[PDB]
Amino acid sequence: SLFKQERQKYIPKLPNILKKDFNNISLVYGENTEAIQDRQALKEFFKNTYGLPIISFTEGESSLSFSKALNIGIILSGGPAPGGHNVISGVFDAIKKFNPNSKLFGFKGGPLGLLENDKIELTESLINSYRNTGGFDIVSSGRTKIETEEHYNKALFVAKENNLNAIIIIGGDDSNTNAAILAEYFKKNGENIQVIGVPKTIDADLRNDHIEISFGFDSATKIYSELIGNLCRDAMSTKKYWHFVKLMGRSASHVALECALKTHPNICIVSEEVLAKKKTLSEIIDEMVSVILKRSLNGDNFGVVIVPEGLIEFIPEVKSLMLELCDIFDKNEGEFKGLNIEKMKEIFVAKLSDYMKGVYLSLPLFIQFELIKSILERDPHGNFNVSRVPTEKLFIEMIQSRLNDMKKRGEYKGSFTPVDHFFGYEGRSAFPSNFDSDYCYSLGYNAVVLILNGLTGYMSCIKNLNLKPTDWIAGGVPLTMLMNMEERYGEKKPVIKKALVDLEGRPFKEFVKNRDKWALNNLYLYPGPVQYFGSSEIVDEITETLKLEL
Template sequence: MKISSLQKARYEYSPKLPGMLRHGISAICVKEGEETQSVADQETIKALFPNTYGKKEITFEKGENTSEAKKQVVGVILSGGQAPGGHNVICGLYDALKATNPENELYGFKNGPSGLIEDDYLIFDDEYIDEYRNTGGFDIIGSGRTKLETQEQFAVAAEVCKKHGITAIVIIGGDDSNTNAAVLAEYFAANNTGVQVIGCPKTIDGDLKNEDIECSFGFDTATKTYSELIGNIERDANSAKKYWHFIKVMGRSASHVALECALETQPNICLVSEEVSAKKMSLSQIADYIADSVEKRAAKGMNFGVAIIPEGVVEFVPEFSKLIAEINELLAGSKADEFNALPTWKDKYAFIENGLTKESMDVFAILPEGIQQQLFLERDPHGNVQVSLIESEKLFSALVADKLAERKEAGTYKGKFNALHHFFGYEGRCAFPSNFDADYCYSLGYNAFMLIQYGYTGYLSKISNLSKPANEWVAGGMPITKMMNIERRHGEDKPVIKKALVELEGKPFKYFEAHREEWAENTCYVYPGAIQYYGPADVCDITTKTLALEQGE
């Protein structure tokens, strides 16, 4: 296989570990902290997790290793969407496992949780692992979105583990995957299988975060990758001086990615879904907000700009959410067949007009025809609108164009408005991990094995103090149940890890809020450039602006 010079150099990079993990396996001891409770719904969560609830937080320190010496056979699973650094979690896990006992084995279950159910695996060795160190992606064993949530699945998983003598499973995933890890850990404990389960916090969306998990892995690399591209577009916009670029970035439920990219690049506009929801902003108000920036800049002779749009923002607009709910109801059951049988879009439009309330029809009517058709023609197998497919960057640029046309007619706007559109998603999920993510992920994997060696289950591998240099990071673990609450999912109450949305009183948003007026009117662009792997630490090892602001750096 031909490899690039960068790939070869990254194979040879030695990730930095937290200080207490550098002493060697035999010199790491455990310090137990307070017993924990879930963030909400304590009695319900406790009843659902009688064997794994209320456990103590733990920290690893320098001292004599008192764990039981036994052969460990560990299975690892990559679950959900890709995130830069996933390979290094597995490398850290493998290295700690082999350093403890060369006889220990690591099974990689292929293509996500389904690999465990289907007993589809490979056994890692040095030669295989070394080809993936410090590289991006999840191609080391593949990933998948199968959920481990039924008793039948758990029973099969227990049988597969028994067959191979597996003592622990490490699940690398986001909030849903780690919720499933907690449920699996409870099943294994309740049925005395002897199999431990450890989770690792992954998501580029940044919404797996709380007082214990300062940052999910992959967020650092993904936002730096997007910010490089946005900076390049800003440079182009400032060169050509004739285009407004509407850039959609990942973030269905939370706007952490959009906000971090805005802090990195200082665009003219960045929408934050959580603010849209809190202020109950309408589509018209959002369009006016962007049009104000276009108008002010045009008055200064600047008919160009950059707007960042989180992919899930339309779901946070109350009137739009109501419209979606009505559409889903309108097309329920046999009505969908009736709608689909209509021969022309004009006939379909009349059907829609007859079926929606006046309020929702008013919203529907202002949408560009392409978006209208997306809402009705691209639905999931249950007949529901696929909101994630809505091209919100095109929606807002079209609404802004309409607003500007009105202002031109009123004589308040005399500029030119030409919009271009971009969506940055997959570009950031499998990049070579930044030094921060390479170090953080390796530490998470190494630390996961220490949790296994000391007998913990239902825990999340936890590395904290992340805004400081790696030698000051603190390694430990926390019970996954501590992060849980009860939410309504598909008509049922379920225990789930609580998603972290952008806090409108938090330091990152407050910094953005204090500067966005100036950015909206003036050209204050910052060009971050490519991720730096070599050079001064203040260039190569810096954390995200979000993490630095949150930690008071």
């Protein structure tokens, strides 16, 4: 692509501190840390790495933990987010500045590549061709979980066979749970193998007071918001369509909320608020039908609706239903064996309580099947496949009935022509914005400096992300501080706690202040394509979420 050729030339921007000679970068030690919850149980699990302090960088003469060339292994883990390839080019450049004989190995297909020792050397020309591109496709990714002594030995072995000083893991809450646990295992067995994590995810559910945002979120919400903008403007143009847009975002509504603040849709559902008010499915339907009715009465027979794809895990009744289908499947593992959807399910309907079966058979037939598969297709970390559940079609179907029932009684004169959308996969491997491009490159560059100071069990961290990159602050966040205890697949396991929308936070407060105006009026915003050439103001733009929060 001609675009591709030019964008490959962009020089990502570092924090001023990371431009210094590496033995002129010294550490500032902050407060020791606690886990978020289950501190007691996490301290006894993380014997060697619990309670590590926040690390900041500042200028000063400081001696490094290596004199000779580094060997670094690196993994792309989980679903892709725009910018991963810049984390890698940042890492590559940093180790080369340290010692030109340093070598970077990329393991293939996620953490599984590490367990099976399936790698490639990441060389200067290879890394050149990926600079500033989207995708994880330089080595590919995967969702393999590392949780057993067997996994840990193979990792140790494979790290030792490749003469690695450190492993950098780029991923979300799941991948960095691997990272924290793996660092503990190494330090526990006196292994001199360092483990650094990098905060990747479009969901933006990996963050805290120190990690201001995960990478990729900026790029993905910009792409989603333009498309949603375009649907709003097409709805205004024809005055006839109701668009229902499902967005990726399994466990949290950061993506939906950002897109709402960008576009001003007539309806955006926030899963977290749904849960807090213990809303039911039909209550949500009533609140959307209501908006649809008042708009039809203003002559507006059209609108745009956003719905987070993980909404079904925040409706307590539907959450219950899925957890029961789970349990019903965990034990009857045998009957299910070689049966089909049609019959896999007769058993389910049969093994459900009258209460849940009543909830279940209340759902449209196609939704019933989909929920089945969502439970079958859990990932290694025990995530339900929700992307796969057509929640926005569940809404459409249930709304149509409700509107028919009201046309029946002459209480709805209107014209309801729904259209469904799901924006998700087309945002994960897009070209990263300038923001994610600088942020990812800095993350990877920063990780090597943490490594050169002998740190392990840290998340690469870059603060003040709302300022010009030059003024960014660099350092490290201990992984254990983001963690709690959580029942996965039946067991109570130590994991990184996903960060959901703060219902007390400014992004949400701000949505709440306006969402009523946006419902009955047409105050759509129309964001454009991401730009990579032109005014810094346009090119280096950031998310509304990040402006409101910092």
